[PDB]
Amino acid sequence: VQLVESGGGSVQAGGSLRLSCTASGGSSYSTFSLGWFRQAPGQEREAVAAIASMGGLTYYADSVKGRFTISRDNAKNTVTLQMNNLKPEDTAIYYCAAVRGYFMRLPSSHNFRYWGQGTQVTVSS
Known part of the structure; x- marks a missing residue:
């Protein structure tokens, strides 16, 4: 299967922005645990937020x-990350990332x- 990242853009500090991600392919979505990762220039890729399957437990980086x-939205096979401030x-x-599995902590790339x-996201003053 493949994942398709929507949303993104450059916004002014304090502004909002909503990334979206859809799973394309056929073979159930509710079997997947999904997570948003990010990566800035220089730093390694870190985790930002994940959402387990079979219920919807969410976890966030501090x-x-x-x-x-x-x-x-299992009906739409989509994960959504709402960034507010x-x-x-x-x-x-x-x-965006996916795995047909479960977990109960904020994951790592490995999961x-x-x-x-x-998707490029740029916040400036």
Whole structure:
């Protein structure tokens, strides 16, 4: 299967922005646990928020908790990351990821097998 990252763009600090991600392919979505990762120039790729399957448990990286809000729509096979108080530290390329599995902590790259191609998000003052 493949993942398709929607949304993205450059926004002014304090502004909002909503990344979206859809799973294309056929073989059930509710079997997947999904997660948004990001990566800025220089730093390695870190996790931002994930959402387990079989219920919808969500987990967030500290730097984004409170502002970011990940969710899922199994009917539409989509994961959604809602970023509300964007700060310049959020500036990076965000990747969507998937795995037909489960977990109960904020995951790591290691947990997913399917990845999107990345989406540039730029926050400036």
